[PDB]
């Protein structure tokens, strides 16, 4: 497919910052202005090490998806268990809160 | 339920819309709407045309309501 | 010599603030000071539930604090630095009536 005009194959290797001006307001603010904390960066670096050379579990539910985090495998915490999540290009620009459900649907 | 137009065809702007009111003495937009079963805007236009002619005169004017009198008799 | 001075007075009771005034003005007739400018009253207001818990009918307390202010700034040239103390001593000091001075 295409990602705001950018194709998937080349979407990989993209510098988050170069693709940055083609994203929504939340990511623009958080990245270009706010910045980011050390823990998130260490998470990124651990991800990079794992890619270059096991499910990398985490508590972060406010970490945005970098394009280089594609085809990655990861688990995330809801409060009681770790929830694996598979990534895809349309998944980019979004926080992991959406992809790890914190509860179950209600059936009487 | 009830449908009313907003645009005469040729002759209805004479056979009734005018020929039938000129006999009246006092008239009003909603009265002429309920009489000729046509929406009010057309009535406004026609009354403007008539005051242009001079047959009727305004006695009380206002955005909510204006009414006329038949001077021609 | 001449400095253009101001006197502030603050209080929560109307009687002392109206008694300090008479003394000070009576004392300053010679130096050229003149009466006050009674300022707008500052109304502190608090509404609180009359109960430590939610129960029964909902009844409210209505506390308030009035603060009164009188300002004589009419000393100025009529009073020099040293002579100001002459006026702040003969008056009857009251335990609660802060009076501040500033040119």
């Amino acid at each position: 497919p295409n990602f705001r005009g950018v194709e998937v194959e080349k979407l990989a290797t993209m510098k988050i910052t170069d693709i940055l001006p083609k994203l929504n307001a939340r990511c623009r603010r958080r990245i270009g202005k706010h910045g980011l904390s050390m823990k998130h960066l260490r998470f990124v670096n651990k991800l990079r090490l794992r890619r270059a050379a096991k499910i990398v579990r985490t508590h972060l539910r406010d970490m945005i998806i970098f394009p280089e985090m594609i085809g990655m495998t990861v688990s995330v915490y809801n409060g009681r268990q770790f929830i694996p999540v598979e990534i895809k290009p349309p998944m980019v620009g979004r926080a992991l809160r959406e992809y790890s459900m914190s509860y179950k649907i209600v059936s009487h | 339920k009830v449908d009313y137009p907003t645009l005469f065809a040729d002759e209805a702007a004479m056979n009734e819309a005018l020929k039938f009111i000129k006999n009246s003495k006092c008239i009003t937009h909603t009265q002429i709407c309920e009489r000729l079963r046509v929406s009010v805007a057309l009535a406004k236009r026609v009354m403007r045309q008539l005051v242009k002619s001079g047959d009727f005169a305004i006695v009380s004017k206002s955005s909510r309501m204006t009414i006329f009198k038949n001077m021609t008799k | 010599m001449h400095q253009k001075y101001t006197i502030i007075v603050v209080g929560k009771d109307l009687k002392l603030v109206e008694r300090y005034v008479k003394s000070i003005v009576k004392e300053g007739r010679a130096f050229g000071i003149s009466g006050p400018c009674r300022a707008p009253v500052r109304r502190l207001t608090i509404t609180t539930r009359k109960s430590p818990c939610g129960e029964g009918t909902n009844t409210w307390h209505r506390f308030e604090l009035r603060m009164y202010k009188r300002t004589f700034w009419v000393t100025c040239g009529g009073n020099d630095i040293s002579t100001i103390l002459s006026k702040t001593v003969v008056i009857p000091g009251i335990q609660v009536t802060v009076e501040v001075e500033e040119p």
């Binding site: 510098k15 910052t17 990245i31 202005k33 706010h34 910045g35 980011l36 904390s37 050390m38 960066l41 260490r42 990124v44 670096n45 | - | 929560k12 502190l44 608090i46 609180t48 539930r49 430590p52 307390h61 209505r62 506390f63 308030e64 604090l65």
Partner: protein
């Protein structure tokens, strides 16, 4: 861990230097000057509390009191508040 470091592109993205807008509320100087120490209380947030009974619920910040409502009807007479009208 005093010698570790990351790619610079991963270091230009750190947070805004302008410290934080989450300082604790201190009424006077007596409170503070500003291993486990690394994380004992790093969660810096407001903790304004009744200067009488030390409670974080129902504190009147109006006029700079910081007095609970239940810890207030008792001392209102001393402070100067009077119940009229």
């Amino acid at each position: 861990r005093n010698l570790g470091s990351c790619g610079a592109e991963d270091l230009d993205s750190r947070v805004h230097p302008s410290t934080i807008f989450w300082p604790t509320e201190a009424d006077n100087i007596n409170l503070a000057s500003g291993m486990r120490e690394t994380e004992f209380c790093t969660h810096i947030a407001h903790k304004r509390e009744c200067r009488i009974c030390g409670n974080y619920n129902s504190v009147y910040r109006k006029y700079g009191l910081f007095i609970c409502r239940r810890c207030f009807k008792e001392n209102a007479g001393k402070i100067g508040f009077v119940k009229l009208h």
